[PDB]
Amino acid sequence: MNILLFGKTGQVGWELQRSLAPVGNLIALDVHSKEFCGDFSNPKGVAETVRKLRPDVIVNAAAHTAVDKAESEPELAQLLNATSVEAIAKAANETGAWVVHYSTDYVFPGTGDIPWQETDATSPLNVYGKTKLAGEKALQDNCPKHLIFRTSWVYAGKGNNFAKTMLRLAKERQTLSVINDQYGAPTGAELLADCTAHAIRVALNKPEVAGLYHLVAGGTTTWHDYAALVFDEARKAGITLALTELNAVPTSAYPTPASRPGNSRLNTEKFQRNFDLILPQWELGVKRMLTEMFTTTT
Amino acid sequence: MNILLFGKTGQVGWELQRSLAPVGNLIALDVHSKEFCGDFSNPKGVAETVRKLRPDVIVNAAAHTAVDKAESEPELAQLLNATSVEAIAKAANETGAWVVHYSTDYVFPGTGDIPWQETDATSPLNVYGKTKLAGEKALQDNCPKHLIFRTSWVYAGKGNNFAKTMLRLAKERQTLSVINDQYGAPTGAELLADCTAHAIRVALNKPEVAGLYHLVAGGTTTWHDYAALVFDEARKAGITLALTELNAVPTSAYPTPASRPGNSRLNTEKFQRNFDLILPQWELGVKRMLTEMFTTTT
Ligand SMILES: NC(=O)C1=CN([C@@H]2O[C@H](COP(=O)(O)OP(=O)(O)OC[C@H]3O[C@@H](n4cnc5c(N)ncnc54)[C@H](OP(=O)(O)O)[C@@H]3O)[C@@H](O)[C@H]2O)C=CC1
Ligand SMILES: NC(=O)C1=CN([C@@H]2O[C@H](COP(=O)(O)OP(=O)(O)OC[C@H]3O[C@@H](n4cnc5c(N)ncnc54)[C@H](OP(=O)(O)O)[C@@H]3O)[C@@H](O)[C@H]2O)C=CC1
């Protein structure tokens, strides 16, 4: 049984090369895949590889994820987050393949306290959310064998991430200022990839689980609380920091082209009973990646 | 459903903290676990934590793995690779918990060409192999709900490994000399942990799969061929190397207290059909860890 993976070199995709490797025979691609087209710009191009490879499961981790630039390039985001998904969906339905795809909390507005469920109404605040919603609707309509996982604040230790950019500030700077009103749950690429591997194995035996799922680490926190923990662990690890005065702030204080949401809390009870899997507190994931980041030996 | 993991900070254990995290509620320990005894020296000590925690699945990645030192300290190896396993097995059988445990190719002699199967006869060449065999026999006899995975040449990117120590030589040195007659298959901690997570989920629904399994990346190579690939990829990555003359050698040329085997090839067909999982060629695993090692940004 063969698995096709697009977006191989992303945060989640890099971890999915690991997790999908024993599930089945894996073929992994990206934009610069030379011997197979993986550029989500050319949707009939990606679609022709689906038809030319004939996979049992397609896992799509390729996506336009520059939230702000998106507003200035709305049509390029549509192509990547909706046009090529529909294209890929339809081609998957020709051979009854499964399609696994990732979405976002930006499909919802911002109305604090309450965590958003699957049956809830959707009102996208910005373009990213708008385009990504379109993709999930295109998929749902064009292919009944799908698994949609909406996630949030996704990070990995390979490459750029929040913790990193903040630490880098904390080394170079003395007093920092970061948001305390956008609430959410940081989700590791490790967790998303690992859960995906098991959901695929269940899906294959129990078609009834097809559908849409909320999938994020447990708990709830803010960018501020988040950075406090990154500083706290840095210190405990013996990193020195030039930072000394940590200040919390409103959203309004910081410009941003795209409207960021206030309430990114997602209820994940559905995924839990449907797949019989645990979703751990966000803090474990972050401490783990921080510890791989700080234990740098060559 | 609760999972108990010993040997949390080892190569395989570090990756099992990741992989077992969604399978069930995880409790992870090591020697210095302060609020729970994880020191495999005190077998009634580890056993009391099994009884005091009451887990559905126990996964044992703690072990004495210093192959040579073992000959000079044979009784300390027995304690760690056999005494505490038996102790843990018996206590697991009190509550019908599963026990997942790791063994080795050193349970077999050395008689080239042919890859060793599960039904094959065992004749341990050194103490490590001897003690570890004892453990797997103690487990099989004391607990019918077990999964034994014999593996080989196990590596990880966190910490010390073969590739690393060789590169370090290749930077510092000009002509290197490494073995070409011990044949085997390098197996990643990533793969062992990932496969373990899925085998646990099958085991739980299908008790019939309990037993002993060979579990190693596919393919076959030698320490020399192995190092050639580590150098080849280093160069391709733009690392510079002071190495220029790579020479292959016999085993005899190098001293070693413990008798190392010649034929570490393991047939893994059993694990494959029994769990419906793919086992990928060793080269993927190694290239992946090399690429995480070489892409060092802070
Ligand atoms: N980061 C986050 O905060 C969130 C992510 N998600 C969802 O998770 C999934 C992946 O996110 P993540 O892996 O973290 O983000 P990444 O940006 O790491 O991954 C997206 C992938 O799309 C690739 N890509 C870019 N342009 C193209 C193109 N023209 N054709 C094909 N591939 C292209 C990207 O490569 P490159 O960057 O090198 O161009 C990258 O490989 C998506 O559904 C995403 O929306 C959801 C909510 C939040
Ligand atoms: N490395 C290899 O080539 C092979 C490994 N295996 C099997 O895989 C499994 C794990 O190997 P791997 O993870 O690679 O090896 P590691 O040495 O990385 O892991 C073994 C663990 O045992 C821990 N440990 C050491 N002493 C004690 C003690 N007194 N009480 C409790 N724990 C202790 C070790 O910690 P610390 O080192 O910090 O003391 C480490 O955490 C074992 O079955 C092993 O035999 C099999 C064949 C080959």
Ligand SMILES: [Mg+2]
């Ligand atoms: Mg990793």
